[PDB]
Amino acid sequence: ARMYSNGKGQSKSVTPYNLTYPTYIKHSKEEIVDVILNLARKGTPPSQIGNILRDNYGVGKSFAVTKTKILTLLKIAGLKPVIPEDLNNIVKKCVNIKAHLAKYTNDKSSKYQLIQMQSCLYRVARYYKSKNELPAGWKPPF
């Protein structure tokens, strides 16, 4: 089940059985690889890179053509971010809640949501600072 609440949803998307090569498409390998690195330098998250490749350029799951994963390609090109993108999105939501509570101090429901959010941050931090993906003395922006 869900980690912070009583949810038991089941909405996911199916991974294919085999992957082949997308011969119906209208670009070369080298063009697709160029499209990714452009979208990266403009500052898009890698989950959004995937959405665009599927929706506009017509490639499912973005790996059948490249034999390599999106984040690994960005490390080969040297475009790696300073913080992993998951930990980064958790710090953003915390900041937002603290900015709301700063002006609407009375909101007990928002107070409740903040302590849940903050717990999730440190649980994620401890993962990354074991795999050597963050400096040992990293601390939140707060």
Binding site for RNA (CB under 7 A): 1-17, 19, 22, 45-51, 54, 60-64, 67, 69-72, 84-86, 89-90, 92-93, 96-97, 100, 104-113, 115-117, 119-120, 123-124, 127, 131
Sign of CA dihedral 76, 82, 84, 85: negative
Q: Which is nearer to RNA, 7 or 137 (CB)?
A: 7
Min separation Cβ 5 and RNA, Å: 4
Q: Which is nearer to RNA, 27 or 84 (CB)?
A: 84
Sign of CA dihedral 71, 89, 2, 11: negative
Using CA atoms, how far apart are residues 44 and 13, in angstroms rounded to an integer? 22
Min separation Cβ 137 and RNA, Å: 18
